[PDB]
A and B are shown apart, each in its own frame.
Chain A
Amino acid sequence: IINGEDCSPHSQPWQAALVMENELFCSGVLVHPQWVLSAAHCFQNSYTIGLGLHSLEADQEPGSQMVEASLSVRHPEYNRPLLANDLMLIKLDESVSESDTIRSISIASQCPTAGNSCLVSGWGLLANGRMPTVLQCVNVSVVSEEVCSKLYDPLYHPSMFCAGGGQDQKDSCNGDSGGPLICNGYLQGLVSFGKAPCGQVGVPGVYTNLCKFTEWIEKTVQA
């Protein structure tokens, strides 16, 4: 997260850390007690998922859980066209007990509103190219579909939307993949991709447009 700040601790209790050999490689979002939503490009054959975290050191985070997951389902149209339909559902091996620091979030059914300010959170790179020690939060604003397609055609597809690009240089960055973009109290997007370097004025990042997938998510969780 570029030009953000430490999140207030446990203010984003749906945030999930996907860790590999004890190092974070993507985030995800708890959307049901047994399911984490993340970007399909974060797929692995198995996962170790950290819930209830703030720092990434579970041994210093009361209320946290490190949980295993074997099964994941990428959207069937992932990467056709290239980069599009970038979402997957990970089924935890066991349902988690929700608490005030581990809680699912509802998915927006309405699509993004151009201009609206939203919140993105993650443990990815800071402006200085270092990794933060605790979860970072920043606001970014949704950009119109006209601007998103002008900047990203031929790779813009409506399973995506753009946010950010302000003079404020607030953005997501590498290591924020799969984490949440919250708009108006609901999960609206997942961090997906963008032009490098992060935080360029006039260049928004691209997020998975989850309003397009509410039926596939519900059906997958219920099957």
Chain B
Amino acid sequence: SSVVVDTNGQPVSNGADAYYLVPVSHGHAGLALAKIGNEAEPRAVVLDPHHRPGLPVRFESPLAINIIKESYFLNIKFGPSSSDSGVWDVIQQDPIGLAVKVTDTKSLLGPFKVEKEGEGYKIVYYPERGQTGLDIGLVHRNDKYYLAVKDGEPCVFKIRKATDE
């Protein structure tokens, strides 16, 4: 029954509008892509102190509704609705652990939920869309703050509609 709302108190839309995930205690930093491992293109999601508010996301559920509830399984993606090149997934990558990364394919039903935490929301990843969720937090490696599973230590965000663009 809990509807996810933006910083204006309005329900977050199902895919139609983009939003920034603004850390509640890191408004100076914002989501960006960075390199991980030996990869030559930046595919990992980090919280970058040089970009604020960072790359906006869309939250998508296949349900034919235009709001998002905390109980829904979601895809989260960067970029326009029309593109699936920015879709989040969680991928094992040493030495980060289970890192949030982008890829260019998308399941009908994504593996994330947005759940109330503290003064805002946390992103929770459910392997195999099962019952047990793993909190997404920050892992500091290589001078970067990677979004990655850090269960019990979630990064807490508020959700700001991206009407500045």
Contacts and interface: CB of A to CB of B under 8 A. Distances in A.
Nearest to A122: B64
Interface in A16-48: 20, 25-26, 39, 41-45
B63 A41 contact: yes
B67 interface: yes
Interface stretch (B8-16, B20-28, B97-105): B8-16
B79 to A, nearest CB: 14
B65 interface: yes
A42, A195, A196, A197 — most chain B CB neighbours (10 Å): A196
Contacts of B64: 39, 124, 172-177, 191-194, 205
Interface string A110-135: 00000000000000110001000000
B1, B67, B69 — most chain A CB neighbours (10 Å): B67
B146 to A, nearest CB: 29
B65 A26 contact: yes
B66 A25 contact: yes
A-side interface size class: 20 to 34
A155 interface: yes
A205 B108 CA distance: 12
Interface string B82-102: 100000000000000000000
A82 interface: yes
A39 B72 CA distance: 14
B63 A125 contact: no
A196 B63 CA distance: 10
A83 interface: yes
B66 A125 contact: yes
A155 B108 contact: yes
Contact of B66 (A82, A83, A175): A175
A41 B72 contact: yes
A181 to B, nearest CB: 11
B65 A155 contact: no
A44 B3 CA distance: 9
25 contacts: A25-B66, A39-B63, A39-B65, A41-B63, A41-B65, A42-B65, A45-B1, A82-B73, A82-B109, A83-B63, A124-B64, A152-B108, A155-B108, A172-B64, A174-B16, A174-B64, A174-B66, A175-B64, A177-B64, A192-B63, A192-B64, A193-B63, A194-B62, A195-B108, A205-B64
Interface of B: 1, 3, 11, 14-16, 60-67, 69, 72-73, 81-82, 108-109, 129
Interface of A: 20, 25-26, 39, 41-45, 82-83, 124-125, 129, 152, 155, 172-177, 191-197, 205
6 A-B pairs with least C-beta separation: A177-B64, A174-B66, A177-B65, A193-B62, A175-B66, A193-B63
